[PDB]
């Protein structure tokens, strides 16, 4: 019977989905125009206190960094992948002046919003 | 318990490795969406490895699935479900049909491109 292994695989696919989704949100927070919207509460952006939004901006540069040719593509993806992993783990480990746990909570606010469903163009 | 904990230590390492591999494949495919990179691969112009015209065409088509443009008919969550599955089945490398070839064949081609070192430093237009 093929029911048990498929449930675990269904969950593993789901985590990958959540990761790519978190990536989609943060990659957009890298953009200057999106940041201003959150800074002023514009265009359906959910309200965040200024320091809370700053955590997400600093963290996005780690998950979605610009290329560093000092590292191999493999070593930089390894660095980036760990940030996604530890975010979803949501441990109390410190990162960017806060915790992976706190960032995960904030990202759930952002995923649950509708600002990213249709993103405004500059 | 130390057999409970070593086995568990091994699975996390395997999961972290797979996620890294996904991001690498994503970096490659996302870059193949670009016109100028495609011209390099059609020839041998900047260290691009040789690929026959149909095989490279498989990669270009597959990249639009893994790295699609936004479809507002679907929620972001629902478009990430479709998109993520292309990454999963690629790593699975089964004989299942996709884009006029198989996931297994695409995985082999993608391993050539990762190993080519073309992507270590990407040339600017």
PDB file of C-alpha atoms in Angstrom:
ATOM      1  CA  UNK A   1       0.000   0.000   0.000  1.00  0.00           C
ATOM      2  CA  UNK A   2       1.323   3.400  -1.121  1.00  0.00           C
ATOM      3  CA  UNK A   3      -0.276   5.792   1.403  1.00  0.00           C
ATOM      4  CA  UNK A   4       2.368   6.447   4.124  1.00  0.00           C
ATOM      5  CA  UNK A   5       5.469   7.385   2.084  1.00  0.00           C
ATOM      6  CA  UNK A   6       3.324   9.722  -0.072  1.00  0.00           C
ATOM      7  CA  UNK A   7       2.135  11.676   3.018  1.00  0.00           C
ATOM      8  CA  UNK A   8       5.729  12.348   4.025  1.00  0.00           C
ATOM      9  CA  UNK A   9       6.651  13.280   0.460  1.00  0.00           C
ATOM     10  CA  UNK A  10       3.613  15.563   0.279  1.00  0.00           C
ATOM     11  CA  UNK A  11       4.910  17.333   3.382  1.00  0.00           C
ATOM     12  CA  UNK A  12       8.454  17.588   2.003  1.00  0.00           C
ATOM     13  CA  UNK A  13       7.136  19.183  -1.188  1.00  0.00           C
ATOM     14  CA  UNK A  14       5.147  21.572   0.980  1.00  0.00           C
ATOM     15  CA  UNK A  15       8.231  22.743   2.871  1.00  0.00           C
ATOM     16  CA  UNK A  16       9.975  23.386  -0.432  1.00  0.00           C
ATOM     17  CA  UNK A  17       6.890  25.358  -1.433  1.00  0.00           C
ATOM     18  CA  UNK A  18       7.047  27.443   1.760  1.00  0.00           C
ATOM     19  CA  UNK A  19      10.737  28.085   1.181  1.00  0.00           C
ATOM     20  CA  UNK A  20      10.307  29.312  -2.418  1.00  0.00           C
ATOM     21  CA  UNK A  21       7.400  31.433  -1.186  1.00  0.00           C
ATOM     22  CA  UNK A  22       9.498  33.002   1.570  1.00  0.00           C
ATOM     23  CA  UNK A  23      12.141  33.580  -1.098  1.00  0.00           C
ATOM     24  CA  UNK A  24       9.568  35.339  -3.300  1.00  0.00           C
ATOM     25  CA  UNK A  25       8.625  37.720  -0.488  1.00  0.00           C
ATOM     26  CA  UNK A  26      12.172  38.557   0.623  1.00  0.00           C
ATOM     27  CA  UNK A  27      13.458  38.962  -2.930  1.00  0.00           C
ATOM     28  CA  UNK A  28      10.777  41.618  -3.354  1.00  0.00           C
ATOM     29  CA  UNK A  29      11.730  43.283  -0.046  1.00  0.00           C
ATOM     30  CA  UNK A  30      15.161  43.750  -1.614  1.00  0.00           C
ATOM     31  CA  UNK A  31      13.445  46.233  -3.945  1.00  0.00           C
ATOM     32  CA  UNK A  32      13.537  49.892  -2.969  1.00  0.00           C
ATOM     33  CA  UNK A  33       9.997  50.734  -4.092  1.00  0.00           C
ATOM     34  CA  UNK A  34       8.481  47.823  -2.143  1.00  0.00           C
ATOM     35  CA  UNK A  35      10.325  48.925   1.002  1.00  0.00           C
ATOM     36  CA  UNK A  36       8.916  52.444   0.860  1.00  0.00           C
ATOM     37  CA  UNK A  37       5.422  51.024   0.622  1.00  0.00           C
ATOM     38  CA  UNK A  38       5.984  49.125   3.875  1.00  0.00           C
ATOM     39  CA  UNK A  39       7.649  52.178   5.439  1.00  0.00           C
ATOM     40  CA  UNK A  40       4.523  54.271   4.779  1.00  0.00           C
ATOM     41  CA  UNK A  41       1.984  51.449   4.999  1.00  0.00           C
ATOM     42  CA  UNK A  42       1.194  51.967   1.302  1.00  0.00           C
ATOM     43  CA  UNK A  43      -0.650  49.874  -1.268  1.00  0.00           C
ATOM     44  CA  UNK A  44      -2.076  47.172   0.992  1.00  0.00           C
ATOM     45  CA  UNK A  45       1.173  46.679   2.894  1.00  0.00           C
ATOM     46  CA  UNK A  46       0.570  45.397   6.419  1.00  0.00           C
ATOM     47  CA  UNK A  47       1.773  47.752   9.161  1.00  0.00           C
ATOM     48  CA  UNK A  48       5.142  46.958  10.766  1.00  0.00           C
ATOM     49  CA  UNK A  49       7.085  48.967  13.371  1.00  0.00           C
ATOM     50  CA  UNK A  50      10.228  50.494  11.865  1.00  0.00           C
ATOM     51  CA  UNK A  51      12.748  48.206  13.609  1.00  0.00           C
ATOM     52  CA  UNK A  52      10.680  45.094  12.838  1.00  0.00           C
ATOM     53  CA  UNK A  53      10.715  45.907   9.111  1.00  0.00           C
ATOM     54  CA  UNK A  54      14.463  46.560   9.372  1.00  0.00           C
ATOM     55  CA  UNK A  55      15.017  42.955  10.517  1.00  0.00           C
ATOM     56  CA  UNK A  56      13.277  41.669   7.388  1.00  0.00           C
ATOM     57  CA  UNK A  57      15.306  43.994   5.144  1.00  0.00           C
ATOM     58  CA  UNK A  58      18.637  42.945   6.675  1.00  0.00           C
ATOM     59  CA  UNK A  59      17.632  39.275   6.529  1.00  0.00           C
ATOM     60  CA  UNK A  60      16.562  39.510   2.855  1.00  0.00           C
ATOM     61  CA  UNK A  61      20.093  40.538   1.885  1.00  0.00           C
ATOM     62  CA  UNK A  62      21.336  37.259   3.376  1.00  0.00           C
ATOM     63  CA  UNK A  63      18.757  34.981   1.757  1.00  0.00           C
ATOM     64  CA  UNK A  64      18.810  36.874  -1.529  1.00  0.00           C
ATOM     65  CA  UNK A  65      22.337  38.245  -1.684  1.00  0.00           C
ATOM     66  CA  UNK A  66      24.132  39.645  -4.691  1.00  0.00           C
ATOM     67  CA  UNK A  67      26.804  37.448  -6.290  1.00  0.00           C
ATOM     68  CA  UNK A  68      30.170  37.122  -4.523  1.00  0.00           C
ATOM     69  CA  UNK A  69      32.712  35.786  -6.998  1.00  0.00           C
ATOM     70  CA  UNK A  70      35.082  35.131  -4.109  1.00  0.00           C
ATOM     71  CA  UNK A  71      32.892  32.120  -3.393  1.00  0.00           C
ATOM     72  CA  UNK A  72      31.931  29.299  -5.708  1.00  0.00           C
ATOM     73  CA  UNK A  73      28.273  29.303  -6.713  1.00  0.00           C
ATOM     74  CA  UNK A  74      27.965  26.134  -4.643  1.00  0.00           C
ATOM     75  CA  UNK A  75      29.414  27.732  -1.512  1.00  0.00           C
ATOM     76  CA  UNK A  76      27.186  30.802  -1.805  1.00  0.00           C
ATOM     77  CA  UNK A  77      24.049  28.714  -2.357  1.00  0.00           C
ATOM     78  CA  UNK A  78      25.101  26.699   0.695  1.00  0.00           C
ATOM     79  CA  UNK A  79      25.272  29.917   2.711  1.00  0.00           C
ATOM     80  CA  UNK A  80      21.921  31.110   1.378  1.00  0.00           C
ATOM     81  CA  UNK A  81      20.178  27.760   1.801  1.00  0.00           C
ATOM     82  CA  UNK A  82      21.070  27.612   5.483  1.00  0.00           C
ATOM     83  CA  UNK A  83      19.321  30.937   6.098  1.00  0.00           C
ATOM     84  CA  UNK A  84      16.119  29.515   4.628  1.00  0.00           C
ATOM     85  CA  UNK A  85      16.530  26.322   6.633  1.00  0.00           C
ATOM     86  CA  UNK A  86      17.135  28.035   9.966  1.00  0.00           C
ATOM     87  CA  UNK A  87      14.274  30.425   9.308  1.00  0.00           C
ATOM     88  CA  UNK A  88      11.796  27.587   8.892  1.00  0.00           C
ATOM     89  CA  UNK A  89      13.317  25.866  11.925  1.00  0.00           C
ATOM     90  CA  UNK A  90      12.447  29.030  13.848  1.00  0.00           C
ATOM     91  CA  UNK A  91      15.009  28.493  16.605  1.00  0.00           C
ATOM     92  CA  UNK A  92      16.026  31.120  19.166  1.00  0.00           C
ATOM     93  CA  UNK A  93      19.418  31.438  17.466  1.00  0.00           C
ATOM     94  CA  UNK A  94      20.435  35.051  16.919  1.00  0.00           C
ATOM     95  CA  UNK A  95      20.566  36.580  13.436  1.00  0.00           C
ATOM     96  CA  UNK A  96      20.571  40.210  12.187  1.00  0.00           C
ATOM     97  CA  UNK A  97      19.895  41.537  15.703  1.00  0.00           C
ATOM     98  CA  UNK A  98      16.906  39.282  16.346  1.00  0.00           C
ATOM     99  CA  UNK A  99      16.007  35.579  16.141  1.00  0.00           C
ATOM    100  CA  UNK A 100      15.136  33.110  13.389  1.00  0.00           C
ATOM    101  CA  UNK A 101      11.975  32.536  15.396  1.00  0.00           C
ATOM    102  CA  UNK A 102      10.949  36.187  15.333  1.00  0.00           C
ATOM    103  CA  UNK A 103      11.708  36.500  11.599  1.00  0.00           C
ATOM    104  CA  UNK A 104       9.565  33.434  10.916  1.00  0.00           C
ATOM    105  CA  UNK A 105       6.712  35.058  12.807  1.00  0.00           C
ATOM    106  CA  UNK A 106       7.094  38.288  10.809  1.00  0.00           C
ATOM    107  CA  UNK A 107       7.283  36.392   7.520  1.00  0.00           C
ATOM    108  CA  UNK A 108       3.992  34.683   8.355  1.00  0.00           C
ATOM    109  CA  UNK A 109       2.411  38.135   8.654  1.00  0.00           C
ATOM    110  CA  UNK A 110       3.791  38.989   5.203  1.00  0.00           C
ATOM    111  CA  UNK A 111       2.818  35.700   3.520  1.00  0.00           C
ATOM    112  CA  UNK A 112      -0.678  35.972   4.966  1.00  0.00           C
ATOM    113  CA  UNK A 113      -1.076  39.492   3.558  1.00  0.00           C
ATOM    114  CA  UNK A 114      -2.101  40.151  -0.040  1.00  0.00           C
ATOM    115  CA  UNK A 115       0.451  42.811  -0.888  1.00  0.00           C
ATOM    116  CA  UNK A 116       2.574  40.277  -2.760  1.00  0.00           C
ATOM    117  CA  UNK A 117      -0.294  38.681  -4.690  1.00  0.00           C
ATOM    118  CA  UNK A 118      -0.060  41.590  -7.114  1.00  0.00           C
ATOM    119  CA  UNK A 119       3.031  43.781  -6.789  1.00  0.00           C
ATOM    120  CA  UNK A 120       2.932  47.472  -7.852  1.00  0.00           C
ATOM    121  CA  UNK A 121       5.441  48.546 -10.530  1.00  0.00           C
ATOM    122  CA  UNK A 122       7.779  51.572 -10.111  1.00  0.00           C
TER     123      UNK A 122
ATOM    124  CA  UNK B   1      19.673   6.574  21.154  1.00  0.00           C
ATOM    125  CA  UNK B   2      23.080   7.386  19.657  1.00  0.00           C
ATOM    126  CA  UNK B   3      21.734   5.361  16.700  1.00  0.00           C
ATOM    127  CA  UNK B   4      18.521   7.381  16.914  1.00  0.00           C
ATOM    128  CA  UNK B   5      20.555  10.598  16.903  1.00  0.00           C
ATOM    129  CA  UNK B   6      23.163   9.836  14.238  1.00  0.00           C
ATOM    130  CA  UNK B   7      20.502   8.721  11.813  1.00  0.00           C
ATOM    131  CA  UNK B   8      18.589  11.928  12.555  1.00  0.00           C
ATOM    132  CA  UNK B   9      21.783  13.969  12.222  1.00  0.00           C
ATOM    133  CA  UNK B  10      22.258  12.399   8.788  1.00  0.00           C
ATOM    134  CA  UNK B  11      18.773  13.273   7.490  1.00  0.00           C
ATOM    135  CA  UNK B  12      19.130  16.975   8.291  1.00  0.00           C
ATOM    136  CA  UNK B  13      22.447  17.046   6.451  1.00  0.00           C
ATOM    137  CA  UNK B  14      20.771  15.390   3.478  1.00  0.00           C
ATOM    138  CA  UNK B  15      17.862  17.861   3.558  1.00  0.00           C
ATOM    139  CA  UNK B  16      20.191  20.876   3.771  1.00  0.00           C
ATOM    140  CA  UNK B  17      22.201  19.491   0.862  1.00  0.00           C
ATOM    141  CA  UNK B  18      19.112  19.016  -1.295  1.00  0.00           C
ATOM    142  CA  UNK B  19      17.845  22.533  -0.617  1.00  0.00           C
ATOM    143  CA  UNK B  20      21.282  23.865  -1.592  1.00  0.00           C
ATOM    144  CA  UNK B  21      21.159  21.798  -4.779  1.00  0.00           C
ATOM    145  CA  UNK B  22      17.728  23.223  -5.554  1.00  0.00           C
ATOM    146  CA  UNK B  23      19.016  26.789  -5.170  1.00  0.00           C
ATOM    147  CA  UNK B  24      21.969  25.982  -7.462  1.00  0.00           C
ATOM    148  CA  UNK B  25      19.708  24.519 -10.129  1.00  0.00           C
ATOM    149  CA  UNK B  26      17.456  27.538  -9.656  1.00  0.00           C
ATOM    150  CA  UNK B  27      20.409  29.899 -10.182  1.00  0.00           C
ATOM    151  CA  UNK B  28      21.335  28.128 -13.416  1.00  0.00           C
ATOM    152  CA  UNK B  29      17.823  27.902 -14.847  1.00  0.00           C
ATOM    153  CA  UNK B  30      16.959  31.462 -13.856  1.00  0.00           C
ATOM    154  CA  UNK B  31      20.057  32.553 -15.791  1.00  0.00           C
ATOM    155  CA  UNK B  32      19.103  30.509 -18.855  1.00  0.00           C
ATOM    156  CA  UNK B  33      15.947  32.650 -19.069  1.00  0.00           C
ATOM    157  CA  UNK B  34      18.276  35.407 -20.269  1.00  0.00           C
ATOM    158  CA  UNK B  35      18.794  36.012 -23.987  1.00  0.00           C
ATOM    159  CA  UNK B  36      22.521  36.729 -23.852  1.00  0.00           C
ATOM    160  CA  UNK B  37      23.294  33.541 -21.893  1.00  0.00           C
ATOM    161  CA  UNK B  38      21.327  31.559 -24.478  1.00  0.00           C
ATOM    162  CA  UNK B  39      23.496  32.960 -27.295  1.00  0.00           C
ATOM    163  CA  UNK B  40      26.593  31.805 -25.421  1.00  0.00           C
ATOM    164  CA  UNK B  41      25.286  28.216 -25.156  1.00  0.00           C
ATOM    165  CA  UNK B  42      24.139  28.010 -28.778  1.00  0.00           C
ATOM    166  CA  UNK B  43      27.818  28.531 -29.576  1.00  0.00           C
ATOM    167  CA  UNK B  44      30.886  28.147 -27.364  1.00  0.00           C
ATOM    168  CA  UNK B  45      31.478  31.862 -26.905  1.00  0.00           C
ATOM    169  CA  UNK B  46      32.242  32.304 -23.187  1.00  0.00           C
ATOM    170  CA  UNK B  47      33.218  28.888 -21.866  1.00  0.00           C
ATOM    171  CA  UNK B  48      29.788  27.454 -22.519  1.00  0.00           C
ATOM    172  CA  UNK B  49      29.876  23.674 -22.846  1.00  0.00           C
ATOM    173  CA  UNK B  50      28.627  22.273 -26.161  1.00  0.00           C
ATOM    174  CA  UNK B  51      24.991  21.239 -26.254  1.00  0.00           C
ATOM    175  CA  UNK B  52      23.041  20.098 -29.329  1.00  0.00           C
ATOM    176  CA  UNK B  53      20.245  22.471 -30.367  1.00  0.00           C
ATOM    177  CA  UNK B  54      17.359  20.319 -29.144  1.00  0.00           C
ATOM    178  CA  UNK B  55      18.976  19.480 -25.791  1.00  0.00           C
ATOM    179  CA  UNK B  56      19.651  23.127 -24.932  1.00  0.00           C
ATOM    180  CA  UNK B  57      16.093  23.870 -26.052  1.00  0.00           C
ATOM    181  CA  UNK B  58      14.887  21.435 -23.385  1.00  0.00           C
ATOM    182  CA  UNK B  59      16.672  23.482 -20.721  1.00  0.00           C
ATOM    183  CA  UNK B  60      15.240  26.785 -21.972  1.00  0.00           C
ATOM    184  CA  UNK B  61      11.707  25.387 -21.924  1.00  0.00           C
ATOM    185  CA  UNK B  62      12.170  23.816 -18.487  1.00  0.00           C
ATOM    186  CA  UNK B  63      13.558  27.041 -17.033  1.00  0.00           C
ATOM    187  CA  UNK B  64      10.315  28.886 -17.859  1.00  0.00           C
ATOM    188  CA  UNK B  65       8.483  26.303 -15.746  1.00  0.00           C
ATOM    189  CA  UNK B  66      10.823  26.425 -12.744  1.00  0.00           C
ATOM    190  CA  UNK B  67      11.317  30.165 -13.103  1.00  0.00           C
ATOM    191  CA  UNK B  68       7.975  31.347 -14.478  1.00  0.00           C
ATOM    192  CA  UNK B  69       6.545  34.826 -14.761  1.00  0.00           C
ATOM    193  CA  UNK B  70       3.718  35.815 -12.442  1.00  0.00           C
ATOM    194  CA  UNK B  71       0.223  34.423 -13.137  1.00  0.00           C
ATOM    195  CA  UNK B  72      -2.319  36.437 -11.159  1.00  0.00           C
ATOM    196  CA  UNK B  73      -5.022  33.882 -11.944  1.00  0.00           C
ATOM    197  CA  UNK B  74      -3.201  31.816  -9.321  1.00  0.00           C
ATOM    198  CA  UNK B  75      -2.306  32.866  -5.797  1.00  0.00           C
ATOM    199  CA  UNK B  76       1.397  33.130  -5.056  1.00  0.00           C
ATOM    200  CA  UNK B  77       1.019  30.032  -2.886  1.00  0.00           C
ATOM    201  CA  UNK B  78      -0.606  28.098  -5.730  1.00  0.00           C
ATOM    202  CA  UNK B  79       1.982  29.218  -8.295  1.00  0.00           C
ATOM    203  CA  UNK B  80       4.780  28.182  -5.900  1.00  0.00           C
ATOM    204  CA  UNK B  81       3.181  24.737  -5.664  1.00  0.00           C
ATOM    205  CA  UNK B  82       3.344  24.235  -9.439  1.00  0.00           C
ATOM    206  CA  UNK B  83       6.808  25.750  -9.696  1.00  0.00           C
ATOM    207  CA  UNK B  84       8.321  23.870  -6.743  1.00  0.00           C
ATOM    208  CA  UNK B  85       7.240  20.495  -8.155  1.00  0.00           C
ATOM    209  CA  UNK B  86       9.434  20.997 -11.218  1.00  0.00           C
ATOM    210  CA  UNK B  87      12.429  21.303  -8.869  1.00  0.00           C
ATOM    211  CA  UNK B  88      11.408  18.237  -6.874  1.00  0.00           C
ATOM    212  CA  UNK B  89      10.836  15.930  -9.848  1.00  0.00           C
ATOM    213  CA  UNK B  90      14.058  17.145 -11.450  1.00  0.00           C
ATOM    214  CA  UNK B  91      16.033  15.981  -8.425  1.00  0.00           C
ATOM    215  CA  UNK B  92      14.014  12.769  -8.384  1.00  0.00           C
ATOM    216  CA  UNK B  93      15.228  12.227 -11.937  1.00  0.00           C
ATOM    217  CA  UNK B  94      12.509   9.762 -12.953  1.00  0.00           C
ATOM    218  CA  UNK B  95      11.649   8.781 -16.533  1.00  0.00           C
ATOM    219  CA  UNK B  96       8.480  10.909 -16.437  1.00  0.00           C
ATOM    220  CA  UNK B  97       7.796  13.045 -19.493  1.00  0.00           C
ATOM    221  CA  UNK B  98       8.219  16.819 -19.376  1.00  0.00           C
ATOM    222  CA  UNK B  99       8.937  19.454 -22.077  1.00  0.00           C
ATOM    223  CA  UNK B 100       9.526  16.813 -24.776  1.00  0.00           C
ATOM    224  CA  UNK B 101      12.091  14.870 -22.757  1.00  0.00           C
ATOM    225  CA  UNK B 102      12.350  13.355 -19.258  1.00  0.00           C
ATOM    226  CA  UNK B 103      13.183  14.670 -15.786  1.00  0.00           C
ATOM    227  CA  UNK B 104      16.123  12.250 -15.727  1.00  0.00           C
ATOM    228  CA  UNK B 105      17.621  13.618 -18.941  1.00  0.00           C
ATOM    229  CA  UNK B 106      17.172  17.213 -17.745  1.00  0.00           C
ATOM    230  CA  UNK B 107      18.940  16.348 -14.495  1.00  0.00           C
ATOM    231  CA  UNK B 108      21.912  14.979 -16.409  1.00  0.00           C
ATOM    232  CA  UNK B 109      22.072  18.064 -18.630  1.00  0.00           C
ATOM    233  CA  UNK B 110      21.788  20.351 -15.621  1.00  0.00           C
ATOM    234  CA  UNK B 111      24.683  18.518 -13.977  1.00  0.00           C
ATOM    235  CA  UNK B 112      26.843  19.297 -17.009  1.00  0.00           C
ATOM    236  CA  UNK B 113      26.035  23.014 -16.728  1.00  0.00           C
ATOM    237  CA  UNK B 114      26.707  23.134 -12.971  1.00  0.00           C
ATOM    238  CA  UNK B 115      30.031  21.402 -13.630  1.00  0.00           C
ATOM    239  CA  UNK B 116      31.005  23.683 -16.549  1.00  0.00           C
ATOM    240  CA  UNK B 117      31.957  26.676 -14.403  1.00  0.00           C
ATOM    241  CA  UNK B 118      30.317  28.988 -16.943  1.00  0.00           C
ATOM    242  CA  UNK B 119      28.039  30.226 -14.197  1.00  0.00           C
ATOM    243  CA  UNK B 120      30.781  31.057 -11.681  1.00  0.00           C
ATOM    244  CA  UNK B 121      31.208  34.456 -13.339  1.00  0.00           C
ATOM    245  CA  UNK B 122      28.436  35.605 -15.680  1.00  0.00           C
ATOM    246  CA  UNK B 123      29.395  37.950 -18.582  1.00  0.00           C
ATOM    247  CA  UNK B 124      27.571  41.305 -18.862  1.00  0.00           C
ATOM    248  CA  UNK B 125      25.808  42.452 -22.090  1.00  0.00           C
TER     249      UNK B 125
END
